[PDB]
Ligand SMILES: Nc1ncnc2c1ncn2[C@@H]1O[C@H](CSCC[C@H](N)C(=O)O)[C@@H](O)[C@H]1O
């Protein structure tokens with residue numbers, strides 16, 4: 001019933017079942033990541049001068065992807081900003097629970113917000129790709145050996161000149177084990193910028209336009225969190 005017990009159990013069933021463990025955890029109510037709401041740094045970015053500018057330039061058919069969305073607080077938030085938004089999660093249980101949690105959303109009603117059981121690695125990316133993608137407790141949910149695929153998928157998911165926001169948490173140093181895996185901005189950078197081979201300035205696929213300590217974090221997130229905004233180039 002404690003967080004640690006639940007984490008221990010979560011990691012145990014991931015060891016036995018692999019990625020199938022996530023729907024199992026959702027069915028059994030072992031969801032220690034679940035916070036019931038978006039993280040404050042997301043709202044404060046959108047409400048900042050850079051965030052206002054990003055939202056104001058959005059095209060009329062701009063699309064948002066929130067992968068590993070869980071109960072979907074972030075997808076609901078982006079939909080409320082006027083974006084046609086898809087919350088994608090591997091667990092059909094999670095997706096139903098998201099549909100319940102946001103049952104009264106006006107954007108769920110209109111179809112502007114949609115929740116779908118999808119594998120982030122496998123689903124067919126729309127032709128137009130995504131204008132804006134938001135990753136929170138998804139990169140850190142993945143085994144380390146899946147970080148490179150995630151970077152590659154992000155590269156094809158975000159249209160040129162589109163934006164990926166990564167709320168990088170938890171930044172816990174050398175702590176081993178996960179999920180949540182201890183991550184840092186460098187690990188996200190390496191995944192997103194791929195293989196150098198030339199060992200040069202990695203800004204080939206993305207420009208890291210903003211990398212900040214959020215001014216308001218959840219109490220438990222203070223000192224373990226950076227918000228980073230990436231723009232797709234080439
Ligand atoms: N390949 C994959 N594709 C889509 N979702 C995945 C996935 N692997 C794991 N997930 C989902 O990633 C989520 C990690 S838990 C955190 C969920 C959400 N970001 C929140 O902040 O509450 C789980 O819901 C899990 O079902």
Ligand SMILES: [Cl-]
Nearest residue numbers: 036037038073
């Ligand atoms: Cl919320």
